[PDB]
Write an enzyme that holds these catalytic residues in place. Structure first.
Site: not given
Length: 269
Positions: A146, A201, A258
């Site tokens: 991330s 994602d 994600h």
């Protein structure tokens, strides 16, 4: 579609990335065994892997992570944690560019990603240097999921060149800057960036290209679904800056996509 040796690496570093979030290591004593809660990092616990330096809410943009020693795999790993609560981070994400001529000519990158790293660069660069000294033979690897994929990518682009190869492994990281920055990260010698993406994602779709952003090449796309085990046949390499048909495809993105990179990530059971 990728090799077993690459798969094993992709797997390990997802867990080093999952360990950024999953406890004990937001700040724990140096030399201590690295451990997670709820089975986030079992390949990390299998190793002789300990902390070198733990940081938390450091620098201007509050950077959290750990620098580790892995004598089994013979690594020196600098891990960054993504945001503590990601849904909010995504929504509050600003797409402002800002120049980064110190990293590469004519390169603009995400102003926040760029200023946060810029702010912890000297302490972390220092800490990475002492580890290199102590263990010249060990591989230097930056990694994160991330927002941490961003920071590890920006730190990798900036620290490479000082005599030690830097491998970057980033999981569902967002774009980090412009075409030129993309080109730099595609060809920057002294290490290989493994930009890993998963199905639909949403984080990799941000910030949008329409705001001047581009992705590095290549891309390692995981096709298995959320909560599905990943094997070496589920990852396909995708070549081309701004390539399509990997994560960058015209369909509706998703958040749970994600949080599943090889296993649970970005969140702790």
């Amino acid at each position: 579609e990728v090799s077993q040796d690459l798969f094993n690496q992709f797997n390990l570093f997802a867990q080093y990335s999952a360990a950024a979030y999953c406890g004990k290591n937001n700040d724990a004593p140096a030399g201590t065994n690295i451990t997670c809660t709820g089975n986030a990092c079992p390949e990390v616990e299998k190793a002789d892997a300990t902390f070198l330096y733990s940081f938390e809410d450091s620098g201007v943009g509050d950077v959290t992570g750990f620098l580790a020693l892995d004598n089994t795999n013979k690594l020196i790993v600098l891990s960054f944690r993504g945001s503590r609560s990601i849904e909010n981070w995504i929504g509050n994400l600003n797409f402002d560019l800002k120049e980064i001529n110190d990293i590469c000519s004519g390169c603009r990158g995400h102003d926040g990603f760029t200023s946060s790293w810029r702010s912890v660069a000297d302490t972390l660069r220092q800490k990475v240097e002492d580890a290199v000294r102590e263990h010249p033979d060990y591989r230097v690897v930056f990694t994160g999921h991330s927002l941490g994929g961003a920071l590890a990518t920006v730190a990798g682009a900036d620290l490479r060149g000082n005599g030690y190869d830097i491998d970057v492994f980033s999981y569902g990281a967002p774009r980090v800057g412009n075409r030129a920055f993309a080109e730099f990260l595609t060809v920057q010698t002294g290490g290989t960036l493994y930009r890993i993406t998963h199905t639909n994602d949403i984080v990799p779709r941000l910030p949008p290209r329409e705001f001047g952003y581009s992705h590095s090449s290549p891309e390692y796309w995981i096709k298995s679904g959320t909560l599905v085990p990943v094997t070496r046949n589920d990852i396909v390499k995708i070549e081309g800056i701004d390539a399509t048909g990997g994560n960058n495809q015209p369909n509706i993105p998703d958040i749970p996509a994600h949080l599943w990179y090889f296993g649970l990530i970005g969140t702790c059971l």
